[PDB]
Design a protein around this ligand. Structure first.
Ligand SMILES: [Zn+2]
Lengths: 515, 431, 77
């Protein structure tokens, strides 16, 4: 019971109890028990992931035991999946391991539906071929897939989720929703109810009414007006050759003034067909989206619900808790209005008014300006001759050393593997010979999709040098990065990257592309 | 010995030439064995990054590794420090960690050191080839930075390269992390970039027990004032953050204080967080930084590639983002500076206005310095601050002046602090 | 007025209006203006030099198409 609350503490302060809740209900599937997979599963098992299943068919080898922290010398020859599950299993007695002694290729042919049982599927070290299939099957049954790959010092991550709508995106920063420019009734009161330290909000409020008067209601706009609006404040410091909160107001002028308007990204949601056309099929995110859109046109008077929170301020106690409660109370109202629309909407559609809970509705409004929707292009689209995003690749390459070279190299290497039956440079005696064949494959690739791009010949050498090795530290990296991308997916709590993430251990740099 | 194929995932980089190879590189089939035998590496800290680093180093071909950590295993550790089980709670991290590691990885020679990094002196650090951090306080990062610098040997003006001990540093904090690579007296040190740190949210004493408007204020009080004013567990007994009872008593006396000013938001977790200055932590971010850092340790010891020029910052929150750059090494730097610091100062000014210059200037920020000079052909302690006894014996001189104490410009100024093991030198300039 | 770009610690790039004479101290306010990031925690970097917010954009030789990055350091571990 409470014993968990103690070990899972340092993370509960990141995704809360509701987050932990999901995490413990999820069930993850890892395709290859390599170091990459192994590590990724290590960062999910430790935080408390519900249960996991490893599907590996290969036998543990010498290299396997050597770079994997979850396979010992003693398991060489044995089923890599099974072997790694026993070690991983130890990291946390609350995680339910499982395994399948078959390969991904075998399952995709005999029980493609098997993956429907998983919340997310993580594949590692898969050959081009197998991916295109896995990505297909899963794309159809709508199972989030995450393809990870370690190659020499190159880490690769490709996320594939048709749609990932998020409410609690946890933004690291954002303008406060103060509403000085479009002040609501209650607020309008709590201001005129003064004169006879006072939150700088009020300070700016009053000296605003004054400027508003001697300008025919004209809110400071210019970087001049704002600048003069500032002196019009210093000039009221009573006798005090000290009055802190008054300077702690002039500073907010930079912000506080215009702090109201609908986020550009929220518009598009409102504009998305999924929001415009509701059907019993429509998931609750979009239902809530519409409810939110209705509020805007109606009791919202053009804007989203009031966030209902304010920044800390140098001020009197009972004076702060009073102002705090204004918003805290306005927000609670709006939430109710947006809750009305929801049930009317749920009715028009024909679902039970109590389909959407209040906890949600409470969270939705608190995060109305932070909603995010991510859509991934299917793997098939990226690989297609007519759907390839050439503009992204060509544009990126303007810099001969943009991480995307590694993407292309990875494509040449798969082309090489399809054609040669083996990866370039695995044995030292092949490195010299293979450089030529890899260069040719690189060109065979580029021509096929028709991409005029210059690839420093130095990258062809390096990839052969790599010998397709899976150096642990590179794998550990991915392990950490992807593990969190999985958790974001499971808790639907942060914002996942969009398409392809490429990390370069050589230069210790990384970038994100949409392919 | 090593079983067939154990290190192929490494041999590729040591036995093969490459374009992106460091210039001093030499492809050889004996490199790996050499690395394995002789390369001594010290890992400072064994929790979060520490655990992750030891694993990474071990599987990358390192064998001779030492780990310093003065900590005891705790329950909260377990969510991201995979080398500890619950059975191991109470024991010393450093011990349990070498234990696990030495066991999981066949012939590792991880040597634990159960103690503060301050119990050792140059003699001890001079013996390692690369040192890796994974500390959780700025002061330690500061301290070990000077230590590594003090080891620098200048062959009359020119620096002797064979006395430079590479220092890789990691830092984690939620879904954010960073790593730096330091080459004492060549690259920016921890001091050189001491400003990239955030400001410390210091609750203004006023509001704490007068204008409380936040649940934290209604805890910072019940800890910084009410506890001292009512020893709950016998007079003189300190507030033990890790003690589930003092937290309960503080949480309880917090609800009351909160209730007094009607500030909702007080909770046990929040109370635990305030009383212990907790930093939310996940295993994921630590796996990332520790991974980057290890790859550098590998690079720095092998010359397989060019080591990260300076800095890497990472953020997991919205997608994945990293930024790498080359932090500049300040030529004025109190630490790095192969020479003293020129201080502009009219011999009229008092002491306090030169003490606080060290205590408050954001470029040199020390917690409690103690200056000293050579006056009548003998070193007299103008002002020291450590042992209460001497501060009062020197506190008066904090009103004197530069012409007052015998300070004629041109003379150095030895300044010592907890922050760094060395003695920082300056040069008086009268203006 | 020369237009420069500055990057969020998430990669998000925003445009700002800065003239060769406006202190660094101001650029940070321009960023907060648009992004809501307190100036007191912004660490700007151009050409690897961490822009001292007392000098000025001209001091760091900032021009029309100039990208700055907000950086950070962390304590935990
Ligand atoms: Zn320095």
């Amino acid at each position: 019971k409470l014993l968990k609350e103690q070990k899972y503490d340092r993370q509960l302060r990141l995704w809360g109890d509701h987050g932990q809740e999901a995490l413990e209900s999820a069930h993850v599937c890892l395709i290859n028990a390599t170091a990459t997979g192994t590590e990724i599963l290590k960062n999910l098992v430790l935080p408390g992931i519900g249960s996991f299943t490893i599907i590996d068919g290969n036998q543990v080898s010498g290299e396997d035991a050597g770079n994997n922290f979850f396979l010992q010398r003693s398991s060489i020859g044995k089923n890599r999946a099974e072997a790694a599950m026993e070690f991983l299993q130890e990291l946390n007695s609350d995680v339910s391991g499982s395994f399948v002694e078959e390969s991904p290729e075998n399952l995709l042919d005999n029980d493609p539906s098997f993956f429907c049982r998983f919340t997310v599927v993580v594949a590692t070290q898969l050959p081009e071929s197998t991916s295109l299939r896995l990505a297909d099957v899963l794309w159809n049954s709508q199972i989030p897939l995450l393809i990870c790959r370690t190659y020499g010092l190159v880490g690769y991550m490709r996320i594939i989720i048709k749609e990932h709508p998020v409410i609690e995106s946890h933004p690291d920063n954002a303008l406060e929703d103060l509403r000085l420019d479009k002040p609501f009734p209650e607020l309008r009161e709590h201001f005129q109810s003064y004169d006879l330290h006072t939150p700088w909000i009020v300070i700016i409020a009053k000296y605003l009414a004054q400027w508003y008067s001697e300008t025919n209601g004209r809110i400071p706009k210019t970087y001049k007006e704002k600048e003069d609006f500032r002196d019009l404040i210093r000039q009221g410091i009573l006798k005090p050759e000290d009055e802190e909160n008054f300077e702690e107001a002039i500073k907010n002028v930079n912000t506080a003034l215009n702090t109201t308007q609908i986020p550009s990204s929220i518009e598009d949601i409102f504009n998305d067909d999924r929001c415009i056309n509701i059907t019993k099929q429509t998931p609750s995110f979009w239902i809530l989206a519409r409810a939110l859109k209705e509020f805007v046109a109606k009791e919202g008077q053009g804007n989203l619900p009031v966030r209902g929170t304010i920044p800390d301020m140098i001020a009197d106690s009972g004076k702060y808790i009073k102002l705090q409660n204004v918003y805290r109370e306005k927000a609670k109202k709006d939430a109710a209005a947006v809750g009305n629309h929801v049930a009317k909407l749920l009715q028009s559609i024909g679902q039970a008014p109590e389909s959407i809970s209040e906890k949600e509705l409470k969270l939705l409004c608190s995060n109305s300006a932070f909603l995010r929707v991510v859509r991934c292009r299917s793997l098939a689209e990226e690989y297609g001759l007519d759907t390839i995003n050439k503009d992204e690749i060509i544009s990126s390459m303007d810099n001969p050393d943009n991480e995307i070279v590694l993407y292309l190299m990875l494509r040449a290497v798969d082309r090489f593997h399809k054609q040669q039956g083996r990866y370039p440079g695995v044995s030292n005696y092949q490195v010299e010979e293979d450089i030529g064949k890899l260069k040719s494959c690189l060109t065979g690739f580029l021509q096929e999709y028709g991409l005029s791009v210059m690839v420093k010949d130095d990258y062809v050498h390096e990839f052969c040098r790599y010998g397709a090795a899976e150096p642990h530290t590179i794998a550990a990296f991915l392990g950490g990065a992807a593990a969190q991308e999985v958790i974001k997916i499971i808790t639907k709590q942060f914002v996942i990257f969009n398409n392809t993430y490429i990390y370069s251990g050589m230069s210790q740099t990384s970038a994100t592309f949409q392919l | 010995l090593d079983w067939e194929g154990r290190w192929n995932h490494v041999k590729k980089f040591l036995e093969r030439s490459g374009p992106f190879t460091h210039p001093d590189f030499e492809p050889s089939t004996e490199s790996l064995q050499f690395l394995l035998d002789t390369c001594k590496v010290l890992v400072i800290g064994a929790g979060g990054l520490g655990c992750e680093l030891l694993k990474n180093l071990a599987l990358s071909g390192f064998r001779q590794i030492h780990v310093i950590d003065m900590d005891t295993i705790d329950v909260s550790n377990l969510n991201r420090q995979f080398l500890f089980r619950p059975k191991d709670i109470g024991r010393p991290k450093a011990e349990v960690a070498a234990e696990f590691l030495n066991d999981r990885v066949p012939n590792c020679n991880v040597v634990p050191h159960f103690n503060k990094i301050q119990d050792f002196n140059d003699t001890f650090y001079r013996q390692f080839h690369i040192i890796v951090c994974g500390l959780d306080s700025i002061i330690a990062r500061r301290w070990i930075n000077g230590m590594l610098i003090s080891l620098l040997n200048y062959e009359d003006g020119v620096l002797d390269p064979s006395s430079i001990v590479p220092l890789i540093d990691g830092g984690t904090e939620g879904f954010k992390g960073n790593a730096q690579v330091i080459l004492p007296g060549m690259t920016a040190c921890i001091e050189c970039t001491l400003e990239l740190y955030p400001p410390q949210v210091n609750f203004p004493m006023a509001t704490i027990a007068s204008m409380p408007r936040l649940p934290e204020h209604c805890i910072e009080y019940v800890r910084m004032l009410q506890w001292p004013k009512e020893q709950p567990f016998g007079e003189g007994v300190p507030l033990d953050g890790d003690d589930p009872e003092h937290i309960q008593w503080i949480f309880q006396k917090s609800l009351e204080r909160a209730s007094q000013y009607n500030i909702r938001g007080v909770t046990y977790r929040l109370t635990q967080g305030v009383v212990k200055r907790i930093i939310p932590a996940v295993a994921s971010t630590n796996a990332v930084i520790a991974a980057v850092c290890a790859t550098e340790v590998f690079k720095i010891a092998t010359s397989a590639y060019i080591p990260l020029n300076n800095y890497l910052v990472f953020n997991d929150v919205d997608g994945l983002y990293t930024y790498t750059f080359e932090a500049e090494r300040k030529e004025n730097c109190p630490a790095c500076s192969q020479l003293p610091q020129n201080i502009q100062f009219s011999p009229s000014a008092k002491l306090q206005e030169v003490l606080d210059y060290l205590t408050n200037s954001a470029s040199l920020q020390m917690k409690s310095p103690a200056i000293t000079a050579t006056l009548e052909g003998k070193n007299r302690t103008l002002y020291l601050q450590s042992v209460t006894s001497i501060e009062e014996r020197t506190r008066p001189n904090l009103s004197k002046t530069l012409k007052e104490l015998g300070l004629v410009d041109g003379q150095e100024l030895a300044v010592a602090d907890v922050t760094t093991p060395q003695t920082v030198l300056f040069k008086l300039h009268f203006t | 007025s020369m237009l420069i770009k500055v990057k969020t610690l998430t990669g998000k790039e925003i445009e700002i209006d800065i003239e060769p004479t406006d202190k660094v101290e101001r650029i940070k306010e321009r960023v907060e203006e648009k992004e809501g990031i307190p100036p007191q925690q912004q660490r700007l970097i151009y050409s690897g030099k961490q822009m001292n917010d007392e000098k000025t954009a001209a001091d760091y030789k900032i021009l029309g198409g100039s990208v700055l990055h907000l950086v950070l350091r962390l304590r935990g571990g």
